[PDB]
């Protein structure tokens, strides 16, 4: 009985691909229009049934915690001016059945180290990992799509998307074999292959459902990719081509396209 | 001998027109592409000859201070990975002839109270005021244009822009008389007039050069507009229609247009 109720948000990194905006502000707090990247990722997890949110964070990232906590002085200001609609955007941003906890990563030693850092809070359960700089706009939350596959197949699941072959140098690419239309069994993961040498055009994105067996593989490993490759030998790992549109907001170019696209879709904002 | 060397940046406000992005992050830190609003405003002041930067700030706004201070852990990370170009975006963001100081505003009691809060650091000098949510893209820094007028005429100067008459309800509008092509003498300021009743279509923007005489008028006043109206009786106040394009980034709509426009101009980013 596979139950995924915990989601890990690695948010301890330095955000260097987005300077100077991120000199003194977490990349995860940068807004797509009027909402931080981390809020979209959290809402997706909650919408997929996650109840326990685990942030692996750092000294200079208090804004992330403060964003999901009460802000009493602001809530007092809004009540005082009678702006009760705004009060609802701020108060109880998370529903009452969800809880958050935070863990300091010693140093920014990698995504793999960040995942390993969450092990005491996760225990032996399977768990989700979401990278907030991958903003996904989907009719059905992408993490829900991935969890459903992981439960049905009793294995780990990597969210993948089709990319142009000429761009494979930018991603981790799975070598995999189809099992059904959207789901493939992973046999290898290759970091940043040449286009002509890429085994598939399926790039790993920042959405994972992982069995707790991953933790031991990361202690011998610092790269989550290498941990996953080790796991492949013991346990089943699948890739799932999810339905949705990803924007890579780790850099200004994808952030900009997300701003334009969700600007139009959700806000009625159109380039003048 | 009129010398404007000090600029005041009111940055203590709650940013409520941009929630939830600003729940736990200052509005002034929100980026236009890859740079915070406050950095554009500061760069404009420095480019106009300002040497003394005065921030009127609040408890939850440490990111602003941290942005203009050294970030040693980040500078160590960038040197360690040999990324010396990025090191230049972060280290000495301000030239060596400029200095910053910070003053806590007791509570967010208004722009007029914020200006008055800076009085001990300003002394009897004329001084600039810039509101970072007014992002101005100009060939010649707008504050320089305003200072030049203030020195030449030995009076205070309000930056104004022509707005559509149907939008006058959104702004403070000067009643004024032309003295030369871009410069007018102010006789009244009317807050948010009906279009058919607006005295002109010249709206005050977030750029001021003010004589120290303003401070006494704000102690009897909490609205900078009312302080300026009092000053008009004693001293000369001019409005200057500056050359430049303003974006009102206090809200998502103008921020979005700034993102599109400066995205294209400075970053090569074009809506897909
Ligand atoms: O040591 C680390 C490294 C990375 N991460 C987290 O892994 C995710 C994916 O890592 P990214 O490479 O997308 O983000 P980054 O902040 O490390 O970016 P750069 O400086 O390299 O430009 C991000 O959400 C990051 O916060 C950690 O939590 N800890
Ligand atoms: O008490 C105050 C009020 C305003 N200000 C500063 O005055 C400038 C113009 O004030 P704005 O109205 O543009 O900003 P705000 O943050 O007050 O916004 P809302 O909550 O009303 O949406 C902003 O730069 C603000 O920081 C202060 O410094 N202190
Ligand atoms: Mg990284
Ligand atoms: Mg990334
Ligand atoms: Mg205000
Ligand atoms: Mg404003």
XYZ file of C-alpha atoms and ligand atoms in Angstrom:
606
model
C 0.000 0.000 0.000
C 2.032 2.885 -1.498
C 1.073 6.229 0.106
C 2.817 9.484 -0.859
C 1.950 12.128 1.757
C 5.319 13.967 2.133
C 6.908 16.368 -0.389
C 10.457 17.774 -0.175
C 11.239 21.248 -1.583
C 15.006 21.788 -1.994
C 15.300 25.545 -1.568
C 18.796 25.991 -0.061
C 20.618 26.964 -3.278
C 22.391 30.212 -4.271
C 20.273 31.100 -7.369
C 23.385 32.394 -9.251
C 21.823 32.030 -12.722
C 19.450 34.954 -11.826
C 21.813 37.651 -10.407
C 21.617 40.387 -9.235
C 17.933 39.792 -8.458
C 18.862 36.843 -6.227
C 21.798 38.424 -4.425
C 19.678 38.938 -1.312
C 16.418 37.235 -2.230
C 15.765 33.503 -2.744
C 15.183 32.501 -6.338
C 12.112 30.605 -5.112
C 10.529 33.880 -3.981
C 10.695 35.531 -7.397
C 7.093 36.081 -8.586
C 5.449 34.892 -11.777
C 3.243 37.996 -12.034
C 2.052 38.266 -8.402
C 2.921 34.896 -6.808
C 6.274 33.375 -5.851
C 7.586 30.305 -7.658
C 7.597 28.393 -4.387
C 3.836 29.038 -3.920
C 2.983 27.486 -7.268
C 5.058 24.400 -6.391
C 3.471 24.092 -2.956
C -0.057 24.511 -4.335
C 0.613 21.726 -6.854
C 1.738 19.378 -4.084
C -1.261 20.189 -1.873
C -3.557 19.745 -4.864
C -2.006 16.297 -5.384
C -2.821 15.165 -1.853
C 0.401 16.028 -0.030
C -0.106 16.847 3.644
C 3.459 17.158 4.970
C 5.649 19.818 3.342
C 9.406 19.576 4.021
C 11.656 22.487 3.064
C 15.426 21.932 2.899
C 16.613 25.483 3.284
C 19.440 27.833 4.263
C 20.402 30.788 6.466
C 19.520 33.508 3.982
C 16.135 32.058 2.985
C 13.799 33.141 5.806
C 11.417 34.790 3.351
C 10.262 31.318 2.264
C 9.262 30.339 5.809
C 7.692 33.748 6.412
C 5.634 33.458 3.252
C 3.744 30.384 4.555
C 3.530 31.605 8.161
C 1.112 34.179 9.535
C 2.141 37.817 8.961
C 0.375 39.490 11.881
C 1.395 43.090 11.233
C 0.244 42.859 7.617
C -2.998 41.123 8.547
C -3.601 43.923 11.062
C -2.946 46.574 8.409
C -5.355 44.938 5.945
C -8.148 44.492 8.503
C -7.596 48.085 9.607
C -8.223 49.408 6.089
C -11.098 46.921 5.673
C -9.448 45.086 2.739
C -10.855 41.645 3.544
C -10.306 40.154 0.080
C -6.593 40.831 0.346
C -6.675 39.342 3.843
C -7.679 36.044 2.203
C -4.614 35.990 -0.083
C -2.385 36.218 2.964
C -4.115 34.408 5.847
C -4.016 30.611 5.874
C -2.306 30.448 2.459
C -2.145 26.758 3.227
C -5.270 24.781 4.077
C -5.664 23.541 7.616
C -4.823 19.896 6.825
C -1.286 20.703 5.619
C 1.771 21.378 7.776
C 5.283 22.688 7.013
C 8.661 21.973 8.561
C 12.122 23.326 7.706
C 15.633 21.782 7.794
C 18.906 23.680 7.310
C 21.260 22.210 4.721
C 24.794 22.548 6.109
C 26.059 24.123 2.842
C 24.755 24.128 -0.768
C 26.303 20.731 -1.482
C 23.873 19.731 -4.289
C 20.298 18.571 -4.945
C 21.301 15.036 -4.012
C 22.668 16.237 -0.690
C 19.515 18.301 -0.171
C 17.311 15.252 -0.679
C 19.478 13.236 1.712
C 19.180 16.073 4.227
C 15.396 15.409 4.375
C 15.810 11.724 5.311
C 15.084 12.092 9.081
C 11.783 13.840 8.379
C 10.760 11.400 5.658
C 11.576 8.110 7.359
C 10.952 5.003 5.298
C 8.144 6.441 3.256
C 8.105 7.228 -0.445
C 8.092 10.948 -0.961
C 7.802 13.639 -3.566
C 10.504 16.138 -4.580
C 9.601 19.384 -6.377
C 11.998 22.008 -7.719
C 10.116 25.302 -7.635
C 12.072 26.802 -10.514
C 10.256 24.279 -12.757
C 6.880 25.993 -13.000
C 4.327 23.642 -14.532
C 0.910 24.828 -15.721
C -1.332 21.757 -15.998
C -5.045 20.953 -15.955
C -4.268 18.085 -13.537
C -1.452 18.675 -11.021
C 1.692 17.063 -12.427
C 2.687 15.631 -9.054
C -0.697 13.883 -8.899
C -0.037 12.336 -12.297
C 3.336 11.070 -11.064
C 2.076 9.781 -7.735
C -0.672 7.840 -9.484
C 1.940 6.069 -11.603
C 4.183 5.378 -8.612
C 1.384 3.801 -6.587
C 0.151 1.686 -9.509
C 3.636 0.361 -10.329
C 5.297 0.346 -6.865
C 8.364 2.199 -8.066
C 9.952 5.599 -8.258
C 8.795 7.995 -10.988
C 10.695 10.799 -12.759
C 8.695 13.467 -14.535
C 9.977 13.852 -18.087
C 9.149 16.087 -21.002
C 9.929 15.818 -24.686
C 12.592 18.322 -25.708
C 14.096 19.198 -29.105
C 17.050 16.940 -29.813
C 19.332 19.932 -30.426
C 18.853 21.015 -26.798
C 19.737 17.759 -25.038
C 22.985 19.265 -23.737
C 20.917 21.308 -21.271
C 19.327 18.354 -19.427
C 19.549 14.991 -17.800
C 18.114 12.580 -20.391
C 16.636 9.148 -19.577
C 17.400 6.058 -21.589
C 14.162 4.156 -21.305
C 11.818 1.667 -22.862
C 8.070 2.226 -23.301
C 5.747 0.254 -21.074
C 2.594 2.215 -22.011
C 1.885 5.450 -23.914
C 3.253 7.948 -21.387
C 5.220 5.690 -19.042
C 8.665 4.201 -19.678
C 11.055 2.036 -17.701
C 14.351 3.802 -17.050
C 17.575 1.881 -17.689
C 20.093 4.771 -17.673
C 20.290 8.513 -17.011
C 22.847 10.497 -19.003
C 23.760 14.022 -17.945
C 23.938 16.542 -20.787
C 24.536 14.268 -23.799
C 25.387 15.553 -27.259
C 22.222 15.746 -29.403
C 23.386 12.978 -31.758
C 24.254 10.764 -28.787
C 21.207 11.340 -26.584
C 19.425 7.998 -25.938
C 15.969 9.609 -26.069
C 14.559 13.129 -26.174
C 12.959 12.708 -22.711
C 14.458 15.220 -20.263
C 14.100 14.890 -16.514
C 12.256 17.787 -14.925
C 12.000 18.944 -11.311
C 9.288 16.497 -10.252
C 10.104 13.175 -8.609
C 8.352 10.478 -6.625
C 11.051 8.508 -4.850
C 11.169 5.378 -2.728
C 13.018 5.724 0.569
C 15.606 3.278 -0.785
C 17.148 6.338 -2.524
C 18.645 7.602 0.743
C 21.233 4.817 1.117
C 22.338 5.366 -2.476
C 22.944 9.063 -1.765
C 25.134 8.325 1.288
C 27.561 6.416 -0.937
C 27.359 9.270 -3.506
C 26.519 15.570 -4.847
C 24.115 14.472 -7.501
C 20.592 13.134 -7.258
C 21.177 11.757 -10.765
C 23.865 9.390 -9.487
C 21.632 8.285 -6.633
C 18.836 7.445 -9.074
C 21.193 5.469 -11.336
C 22.200 3.325 -8.351
C 18.572 2.786 -7.326
C 17.861 1.421 -10.832
C 19.814 -1.736 -9.987
C 17.776 -2.638 -6.900
C 14.367 -1.165 -7.638
C 12.018 -0.105 -10.415
C 12.348 3.460 -11.725
C 9.908 4.792 -14.321
C 9.784 7.990 -16.336
C 6.387 9.564 -16.979
C 5.717 12.005 -19.812
C 3.243 14.216 -17.944
C 0.514 16.395 -19.477
C 1.381 20.043 -18.827
C 3.579 22.960 -19.861
C 6.860 23.490 -18.013
C 8.681 26.797 -17.798
C 12.327 26.782 -16.604
C 12.274 29.778 -14.284
C 15.836 29.148 -12.994
C 16.935 31.813 -15.527
C 15.362 35.001 -16.902
C 14.460 33.547 -20.328
C 11.978 30.905 -19.139
C 10.771 33.154 -16.346
C 9.894 35.711 -18.986
C 7.897 33.246 -21.065
C 6.043 32.157 -17.928
C 5.286 35.799 -17.103
C 3.876 36.382 -20.597
C 1.894 33.118 -20.725
C 0.375 33.093 -17.234
C 0.056 36.862 -17.415
C -2.332 36.401 -20.317
C -4.047 33.256 -19.077
C -4.667 34.125 -15.443
C -4.375 37.950 -15.351
C -5.604 39.299 -18.688
C -2.228 40.928 -19.298
C -1.224 41.279 -22.917
C 1.993 42.785 -24.284
C 1.403 46.353 -25.404
C 24.689 77.690 -4.680
C 22.081 74.887 -4.866
C 23.720 71.447 -4.480
C 21.655 68.237 -4.456
C 23.861 65.404 -3.156
C 21.372 63.440 -0.960
C 18.502 61.220 -2.181
C 15.784 59.696 0.034
C 14.203 56.336 -0.897
C 10.955 55.722 1.036
C 10.872 51.935 1.225
C 9.014 51.257 4.508
C 5.578 50.512 3.007
C 3.473 47.312 3.028
C 3.229 46.758 -0.781
C -0.421 45.540 -0.471
C -1.296 46.250 -4.126
C 1.042 43.330 -5.124
C -0.040 40.453 -2.797
C 0.750 37.632 -2.232
C 4.157 38.266 -3.820
C 4.873 40.982 -1.242
C 3.605 39.165 1.834
C 7.169 38.446 2.942
C 9.237 40.319 0.376
C 9.550 44.099 -0.105
C 7.843 45.424 -3.202
C 11.078 47.298 -3.950
C 12.924 43.985 -4.311
C 10.657 42.632 -7.040
C 12.763 42.294 -10.224
C 12.148 43.803 -13.637
C 13.644 40.799 -15.455
C 16.798 40.251 -13.350
C 17.184 43.443 -11.273
C 15.162 44.776 -8.339
C 13.110 47.951 -8.693
C 15.158 49.571 -5.947
C 18.399 48.999 -7.934
C 17.073 50.860 -10.955
C 16.059 53.796 -8.729
C 19.424 53.852 -6.970
C 21.359 53.659 -10.248
C 19.372 56.631 -11.579
C 20.244 58.696 -8.509
C 23.943 57.786 -8.671
C 23.945 58.555 -12.389
C 22.503 61.987 -11.553
C 25.339 62.833 -9.175
C 23.878 61.720 -5.846
C 26.501 60.601 -3.337
C 24.481 60.071 -0.141
C 21.676 57.499 -0.315
C 19.127 57.569 2.537
C 16.675 54.687 2.907
C 13.610 55.143 5.130
C 12.801 51.538 5.851
C 11.093 49.029 8.145
C 11.590 45.867 10.210
C 10.691 43.400 7.481
C 12.801 45.030 4.754
C 16.341 43.777 5.452
C 16.676 42.418 1.922
C 17.027 46.003 0.661
C 20.014 46.702 2.924
C 21.524 43.301 2.144
C 21.229 43.924 -1.575
C 23.611 46.929 -1.439
C 25.948 45.407 1.161
C 28.624 42.797 0.543
C 27.352 39.192 0.405
C 30.484 37.326 1.478
C 29.174 33.768 1.280
C 27.881 34.344 -2.248
C 31.065 36.088 -3.348
C 32.996 33.100 -1.980
C 30.778 30.671 -3.896
C 31.226 32.584 -7.166
C 35.012 32.890 -6.822
C 35.144 29.200 -5.926
C 33.451 28.206 -9.192
C 35.544 30.803 -11.061
C 32.501 32.836 -12.202
C 34.207 36.234 -12.131
C 31.700 38.003 -14.392
C 28.906 37.195 -11.972
C 31.152 38.378 -9.141
C 31.042 41.834 -10.760
C 27.222 41.995 -10.681
C 27.314 41.438 -6.941
C 30.498 43.042 -5.574
C 30.548 46.818 -5.163
C 27.114 47.225 -6.791
C 27.565 50.829 -5.769
C 30.615 52.816 -6.838
C 33.126 53.756 -4.188
C 32.086 57.429 -3.980
C 28.527 56.626 -2.837
C 27.407 55.677 0.669
C 24.124 54.334 2.103
C 22.419 54.812 5.446
C 19.119 53.436 6.771
C 16.441 54.862 9.120
C 13.500 52.916 10.575
C 10.100 54.535 10.104
C 8.143 53.974 13.327
C 5.099 52.650 11.393
C 3.924 52.997 7.756
C 2.364 56.396 8.434
C 2.600 57.707 4.827
C 5.061 59.024 2.227
C 4.943 62.433 3.879
C 5.856 60.910 7.225
C 8.607 58.903 5.527
C 10.130 62.048 4.045
C 9.936 63.785 7.425
C 11.625 60.751 8.976
C 14.729 61.511 6.837
C 15.081 65.087 8.146
C 17.949 64.416 10.636
C 20.080 62.833 7.915
C 19.298 65.529 5.360
C 19.789 68.634 7.483
C 19.116 71.925 5.748
C 20.046 70.753 2.301
C 17.792 70.291 -0.702
C 17.376 66.632 -1.439
C 15.935 64.186 -3.899
C 13.103 61.705 -3.261
C 12.624 58.655 -5.508
C 9.829 56.087 -5.326
C 11.271 52.856 -6.695
C 7.921 51.553 -7.894
C 8.061 54.314 -10.551
C 10.532 52.728 -12.954
C 11.685 55.277 -15.515
C 13.627 54.300 -18.642
C 15.321 57.449 -19.964
C 18.308 58.356 -22.130
C 19.256 60.979 -19.504
C 18.549 60.090 -15.856
C 15.250 61.725 -14.900
C 16.567 62.829 -11.515
C 19.391 64.657 -13.309
C 16.837 66.471 -15.446
C 14.960 67.526 -12.304
C 18.030 68.559 -10.344
C 19.192 70.724 -13.231
C 15.883 72.594 -13.149
C 15.957 72.957 -9.365
C 19.455 74.434 -9.346
C 18.708 76.830 -12.215
C 15.490 78.118 -10.616
C 16.294 77.783 -6.874
C 13.078 75.951 -6.105
C 11.604 72.534 -5.579
C 10.780 70.419 -8.643
C 8.111 67.724 -9.117
C 8.529 65.281 -11.968
C 5.333 65.167 -14.013
C 4.140 63.218 -17.005
C 1.280 63.781 -19.403
C -1.525 61.298 -18.797
C -4.817 60.675 -20.627
C -7.519 62.898 -19.183
C -9.787 59.903 -18.530
C -7.223 58.525 -16.062
C -6.750 61.589 -13.854
C -8.569 59.880 -10.977
C -5.487 57.693 -10.477
C -3.015 60.523 -9.742
C -2.097 63.724 -8.035
C -2.473 66.392 -10.743
C -0.706 69.782 -10.708
C -2.448 73.011 -11.556
C 0.344 74.977 -13.147
C 1.320 77.659 -15.590
C 3.999 77.252 -18.274
C 7.256 79.091 -17.771
C 9.119 77.313 -20.605
C 8.421 74.277 -22.815
C 8.810 71.531 -20.207
C 8.754 73.518 -16.964
C 5.684 74.953 -15.231
C 5.066 76.868 -12.027
C 2.805 74.956 -9.653
C -0.079 76.828 -8.020
C -2.146 73.874 -6.718
C -2.008 70.085 -6.401
C -5.307 68.206 -6.577
C -5.486 64.577 -5.492
C -7.439 62.308 -7.838
C -9.686 64.816 -9.645
C -12.512 63.811 -11.958
C -11.324 63.898 -15.597
C -13.602 66.823 -16.498
C -12.407 68.746 -13.438
C -8.668 68.071 -13.617
C -6.764 71.396 -13.909
C -4.159 69.905 -16.264
C -3.211 66.451 -17.512
C 0.183 66.618 -15.729
C 0.419 63.860 -13.104
C 3.003 63.875 -10.345
C 5.346 60.907 -10.472
C 7.723 59.449 -7.886
C 10.588 61.875 -8.498
C 11.045 65.016 -6.419
C 13.723 67.582 -5.696
C 12.732 69.310 -2.479
C 14.028 72.240 -0.466
C 14.570 71.556 3.228
C 11.768 74.031 3.956
C 9.395 71.089 3.265
C 10.170 69.504 6.641
C 8.434 72.168 8.759
C 5.348 71.900 6.559
C 5.193 68.139 7.168
C 5.349 68.544 10.973
C 2.126 70.566 10.871
C 0.631 67.952 8.479
C 0.290 61.820 6.365
C 0.602 63.215 2.903
C 3.576 64.630 1.057
C 1.011 66.287 -1.225
C -0.264 68.454 1.627
C 3.279 69.374 2.604
C 4.024 70.505 -0.952
C 0.835 72.598 -1.121
C 1.926 74.445 2.029
C 5.439 75.000 0.665
C 3.899 76.684 -2.410
C 2.964 79.696 -0.278
C 6.490 80.388 0.983
C 8.692 79.087 -1.808
C 8.820 78.340 -5.520
C 7.653 74.894 -6.658
C 7.958 73.865 -10.307
C 6.729 70.858 -12.246
C 8.977 69.447 -14.964
C 7.703 67.281 -17.813
C 10.737 64.991 -18.047
C 11.893 63.035 -21.109
C 11.497 59.320 -20.384
C 9.040 56.440 -20.107
C 7.558 55.655 -16.694
C 6.152 52.289 -15.698
C 3.998 52.093 -12.528
C 5.369 48.911 -10.995
C 3.359 49.321 -7.749
C 0.862 46.853 -9.301
C 1.172 43.844 -11.620
C -0.165 45.616 -14.741
C 2.603 48.217 -15.094
C 5.198 45.771 -13.828
C 4.202 43.479 -16.663
C 4.585 46.174 -19.306
C 8.000 47.042 -17.876
C 8.995 43.366 -18.005
C 7.958 43.129 -21.666
C 9.544 46.449 -22.695
C 12.880 46.217 -20.875
C 12.910 42.489 -21.539
C 13.039 43.270 -25.241
C 15.246 46.345 -25.042
C 17.932 45.183 -22.637
C 17.644 41.357 -22.717
C 16.537 40.340 -26.210
C 13.445 38.670 -24.768
C 10.430 38.605 -27.032
C 7.005 37.128 -26.272
C 6.681 33.689 -27.823
O 23.011 22.448 -2.406
C 21.950 22.588 -3.010
C 21.798 22.726 -4.429
C 20.569 22.876 -4.943
N 19.433 22.906 -4.167
C 18.106 23.083 -4.799
O 18.051 22.263 -5.950
C 17.128 22.842 -6.911
C 17.700 22.706 -8.310
O 18.988 23.382 -8.392
P 19.192 24.576 -9.448
O 20.523 24.431 -10.110
O 17.990 24.671 -10.335
O 19.245 25.861 -8.473
P 20.466 26.616 -7.749
O 19.947 27.620 -6.775
O 21.443 25.586 -7.279
O 21.052 27.431 -8.997
P 22.491 27.959 -9.506
O 23.138 28.700 -8.352
O 23.264 26.716 -9.902
O 22.167 28.858 -10.680
C 16.854 24.280 -6.442
O 15.525 24.422 -5.936
C 17.903 24.495 -5.334
O 17.418 25.372 -4.339
C 19.498 22.783 -2.785
O 18.519 22.799 -2.034
N 20.772 22.642 -2.291
O 4.353 54.863 5.546
C 4.819 54.807 4.411
C 4.068 54.798 3.189
C 4.721 54.729 2.021
N 6.093 54.665 1.935
C 6.750 54.583 0.611
O 6.115 55.501 -0.257
C 6.241 55.035 -1.627
C 4.938 55.275 -2.367
O 3.848 54.570 -1.702
P 3.007 53.467 -2.512
O 1.553 53.629 -2.207
O 3.412 53.485 -3.952
O 3.523 52.101 -1.824
P 2.977 51.251 -0.574
O 3.953 50.182 -0.211
O 2.522 52.206 0.482
O 1.726 50.530 -1.267
P 0.261 50.005 -0.834
O 0.433 49.149 0.405
O -0.555 51.255 -0.566
O -0.227 49.221 -2.034
C 6.702 53.571 -1.550
O 8.058 53.425 -1.977
C 6.543 53.229 -0.057
O 7.509 52.284 0.354
C 6.890 54.666 3.073
O 8.122 54.615 3.063
N 6.188 54.726 4.252
Mg 22.719 24.072 -8.955
Mg 16.761 24.433 -11.881
Mg 0.532 53.822 0.075
Mg 3.446 53.892 -5.899
